[PDB]
Amino acid sequence: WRKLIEGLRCYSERKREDGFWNLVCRVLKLTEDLLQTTPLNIRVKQVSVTEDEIFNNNKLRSDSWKIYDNKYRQLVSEFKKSKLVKVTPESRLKLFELTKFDKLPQIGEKSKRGYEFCTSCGVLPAVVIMPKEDELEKKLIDLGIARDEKDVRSIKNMISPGERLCPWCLVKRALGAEPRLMRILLLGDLYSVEKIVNEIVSRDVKIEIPSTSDIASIKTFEEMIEKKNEICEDLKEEEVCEKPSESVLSMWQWFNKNYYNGINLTIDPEEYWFSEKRRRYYFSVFRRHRITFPSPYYALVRADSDYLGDLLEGKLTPYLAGIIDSGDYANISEKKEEVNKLLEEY
RNA sequence: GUUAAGUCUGGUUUCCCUCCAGGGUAUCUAAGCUUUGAAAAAAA
Ligand SMILES: Nc1ncnc2c1ncn2[C@@H]1O[C@H](COP(=O)(O)OP(=O)(O)NP(=O)(O)O)[C@@H](O)[C@H]1O
Numbered sequence: 001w002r003k004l005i006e007g008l009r010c011y012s013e014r015k016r017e018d019g020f021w022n023l024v025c026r027v028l029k030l031t032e033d034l035l036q037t038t039p040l041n042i043r044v045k046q047v048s049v050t051e052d053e054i055f056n057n058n059k060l061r062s063d064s065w066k067i068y069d070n071k072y073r074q075l076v077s078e079f080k081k082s083k084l085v086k087v088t089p090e091s092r093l094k095l096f097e098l099t100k101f102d103k104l105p106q107i108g109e110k111s112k113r114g115y116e117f118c119t120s121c122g123v124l125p126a127v128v129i130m131p132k133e134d135e136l137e138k139k140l141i142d143l144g145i146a147r148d149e150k151d152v153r154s155i156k157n158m159i160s161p162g163e164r165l166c167p168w169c170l171v172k173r174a175l176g177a178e179p180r181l182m183r184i185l186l187l188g189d190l191y192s193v194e195k196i197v198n199e200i201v202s203r204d205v206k207i208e209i210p211s212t213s214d215i216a217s218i219k220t221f222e223e224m225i226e227k228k229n230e231i232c233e234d235l236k237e238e239e240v241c242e243k244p245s246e247s248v249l250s251m252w253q254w255f256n257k258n259y260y261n262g263i264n265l266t267i268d269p270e271e272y273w274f275s276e277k278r279r280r281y282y283f284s285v286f287r288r289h290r291i292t293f294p295s296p297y298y299a300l301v302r303a304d305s306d307y308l309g310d311l312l313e314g315k316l317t318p319y320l321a322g323i324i325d326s327g328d329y330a331n332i333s334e335k336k337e338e339v340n341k342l343l344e345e346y
Numbered sequence: 347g348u349u350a351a352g353u354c355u356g357g358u359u360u361c362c363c364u365c366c367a368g369g370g371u372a373u374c375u376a377a378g379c380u381u382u383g384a385a386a387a388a389a390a
């Protein structure tokens with residue numbers, strides 16, 4: 001984490017002017033000792049083994065195949081014993097004097113109430129506070145979150161109005177504006193932080209990461225690819241029927257075989273059809289063109305296996321899911337009829 | 347023996363409906379529209 005935050009500092013210093021990175025540099029300079037601690041904690045347990053119970057005098061003994069599972073169960077039991085206590089990473093930080101006095105650095109709205117919470121964690125105090133809107137062009141300069149009129153767009157693109165970021169939230173959003181810094185944390189003590197930040201500080205590879213508005217319009221995109229221009233007459237000059245720029249390539253395999261067909265996929269539909277001003281317009285264009293109106297709904301899909309732990313620990317519960325259970329393995333003889341029926345034929 | 351004269355009566359009673367069938371079958375809602383547009387983060 002130290003390496004990656006120092007690399008973020010370096011890269012933000014390099015793009016000191018390229019927008020949203022002046023601010024990343026400014027915050028990494030302001031709150032440095034906060035970011036010294038990683039937003040993720042780890043539990044680490046350790047069981048050992050001796051020559052005893054595995055060797056008799058100089059060769060094996062009986063029950064020697066019975067220690068590896070024994071030690072592994074020791075490890076799993078110590079892990080699940082620890083699991084009884086949950087410590088949040090935010091509890092690592094020394095935020096007492098920062099919040100007891102107004103010595104908390106706040107860019108944007110100086111909070112009237114000492115400090116505000118971040119809208120992305122809800123738990124930590126914010127360091128960057130962008131207004132919702134009253135003018136949205138000088139009110140983000142009169143607050144000093146930006147110094148010039150050119151970085152207004154540069155920041156308003158990455159940090160939305162009304163948003164309040166914590167140090168960690170901003171570090172993440174920065175790593176997201178440029179996802180290749182993680183190579184520092186990825187190559188694993190093989191290069192130097194400076195070598196890699198200098199390797200990727202030359203090339204300008206605009207990585208793209210979809211939003212929820214992107215997904216809620218997939219089949220819209222897919223449609224426009226076929227009905228290319230027969231329904232793009234009012235939208236030719238709205239940069240939605242424009243050209244692919246240089247090399248914008250993404251981890252999203254669907255984005256990488258529909259980007260060049262003629263409809264730029266790097267536009268963000270929250271302004272075009274998922275907007276509230278340009279909405280009555282795009283929908284009115286699509287009525288006379290008889291195409292599907294996008295539905296404002298995606299599907300978050302999560303999958304979890306069943307009983308993987310005791311599967312790796314040898315319990316037959318993932319076989320008899322529901323009938324036998326984890327607790328049934330405190331008196332496993334009691335399910336003799338239903339357990340002996342299984343490994344018998346296994 | 348003779349004569350002479352006919353007179354009375356001119357439809358009554360009972361039965362006036364009984365029994366079965368008193369609705370059956372089909373259709374029992376259909377197709378649309380299932381929220382939209384303004385307000386998402388405000389001054390002290
Ligand atoms: N022994 C292990 N080896 C590797 N990964 C593990 C091990 N134990 C747990 N994990 C992972 O750490 C997390 C443990 O959470 P969890 O997934 O709830 O445990 P579990 O063993 O899968 N029981 P389950 O609730 O059925 O999933 C998961 O992401 C697991 O993949």
Ligand SMILES: [Mn+2]
Binds near residue numbers: 304
């Ligand atoms: Mn699991």
Ligand SMILES: [Zn+2]
Binds near residue numbers: 119121124166167168
């Ligand atoms: Zn935050």
